């Protein structure tokens, strides 16, 4: 037997789990688009829980105010979703473990009449599926 304590269920609820390193969902102010190098090293032990489950494929979706317009928004809200998916493959997930879903402004969680709002409703998010 191991040292420590036991480690029964190791992907059994591991959104969780996912959401604990995470501590939630991110933002994205000043140019509204740009990840930060703190969150990016969240992103490295996001990417090494996803590779200790490679049976347990995620779905990333991210989020834009609504001050911009559905051609603007689309891509937007898709850039992202693939910034956070390329940062997970690049630090060691398969390509084939990540899907990522453009969410433009649906569903929104602030409004836009001030800069931080619109950084609060840009967010992006990660769920197993």
């Known amino acids: 037997a191991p040292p420590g304590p036991p480690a029964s269920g190791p992907c059994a609820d591991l959104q969780s789990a996912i959401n604990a390193v995470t501590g939630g969902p991110i933002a ?3 140019d509204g ?18 590779k200790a489950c ?10 834009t105010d609504n001050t911009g317009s559905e051609g603007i928004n689309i891509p937007l809200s898709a850039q992202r979703a693939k910034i956070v998916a390329d ?12 899907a990522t879903v453009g969410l433009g402004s649906v569903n929104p969680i602030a409004s836009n009449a001030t800069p ?3 950084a609060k409703n840009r967010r992006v998010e990660i769920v197993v599926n």
């Open 28 to 30: 994205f102010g000043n």
């Open 54 to 63: 490679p049976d347990a494929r995620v779905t990333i979706n991210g989020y």
């Open 87 to 98: 940062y997970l493959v690049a630090r060691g997930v398969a390509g084939d473990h990540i």
């Open 116 to 118: 931080e709002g619109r």
């Open 33 to 50: 688009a740009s990840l930060i190098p703190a969150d990016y090293e969240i992103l490295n032990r996001v990417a090494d829980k996803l």
